[PDB]
Symmetry: C2
Subunit: 196 residues, 2 copies
């Protein structure tokens, strides 16, 4: 008999989506299907078997669904396996700029540039520019197996010179969701440096 799945090998979903994986056989009269994650942990989905198809529905998809899901199809005593790696992305909010105080001659100010609920972090790079100039960019490959929706941030301290007045701080959050695109997904925020 033969085993097949939809999608063929991977599902990249947005957190909160209704993700449905299916497992089917051909050449088998009475197949039995079972699903599992690579480490036999909870499926965090509901399995429904109908005829020659088994469906694993994870709705809403979340971090507990981020696994290689392996469907094992059994026909008589022969079993076949096929897996689909379920992946999730989250980029729902523009970043936010926060200044320590108003511009003051000789007083360094600290800009906090942050983005909420963005996933995954290892494909997020935050840029903080003043004008078309990059003050600092930040990447996140070290906060390791954290899956949660923590807020990621960039911080830069600088002393305002007379010439900065009326310049625009630009904070850009770039998520490289598509590895086949040179240009990432970007949400940005802008704050005018006005004197006070």
């Amino acid at each position: 008999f033969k085993i097949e799945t939809t999608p063929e090998s991977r599902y990249l979903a947005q957190i909160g989506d209704s993700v449905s994986l299916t497992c089917s056989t051909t050449g088998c009269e009475s197949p039995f299907f079972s699903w599992r994650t690579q480490i036999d942990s909870p499926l965090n989905g509901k399995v429904t078997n109908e005829g020659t198809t088994s469906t694993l529905t994870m709705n809403p998809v979340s971090f507990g669904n981020e696994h290689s899901y392996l469907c094992t199809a059994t026909c008589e005593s022969r079993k076949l396996e096929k897996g689909i790696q379920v992946e999730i992305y989250s980029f729902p909010k523009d970043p936010e700029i926060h200044l320590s105080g108003p511009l003051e001659a000789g007083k360094p100010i600290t800009v906090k540039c942050s983005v909420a609920d963005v996933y995954p972090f290892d494909r997020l790079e935050i840029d903080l520019l003043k004008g078309d100039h990059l003050m600092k960019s930040q990447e996140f490959l070290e906060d390791a197996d954290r899956k949660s929706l923590e807020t990621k941030s960039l911080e830069v301290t600088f002393t305002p010179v007379i010439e900065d007045i009326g310049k625009v701080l630009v904070c850009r959050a770039k998520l490289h969701i598509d590895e086949m695109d040179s240009v990432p997904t970007v949400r940005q925020a802008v704050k005018e440096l006005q004197v006070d």
Copy 2:
């Protein structure tokens, strides 16, 4: 001048929902608003000012929104403040029952009952029942990752007997979030011990 908010002082929201807080003034010609959290951390939401009202839109509401949000209204050189406590919870999925294997009369078998994406844990009770019979109940007032969203489990092993065929295994997940309700919020899964 005067300040006002909607809601008045608190909001219990479900993670994933789109929540809006508005702050207005009366008695002020050209007021200016700003929001901040009790610890001056990111808003993790979007502020929009239209005339005499400011709106802080949190969509989706998530962990970075678990705070008292404070609106600061400014008129002429004077400021007023007024806060709204935003509480959050998550109970988006039915629990998932999982038997250790082949159901055979008299053979000990482990029932793993799990619940995914729950917050907060200390408000959760998972009960494994056999008819109106509680076999085991689990509480989690002890967790090492507060804002986790990690799957919670209850395991029990037992040997059925001939009377148990037909009886349903029932795993109930109760979340007591609502204090003005005498009955916790409930989700359950059932698995019949069917035999040959």
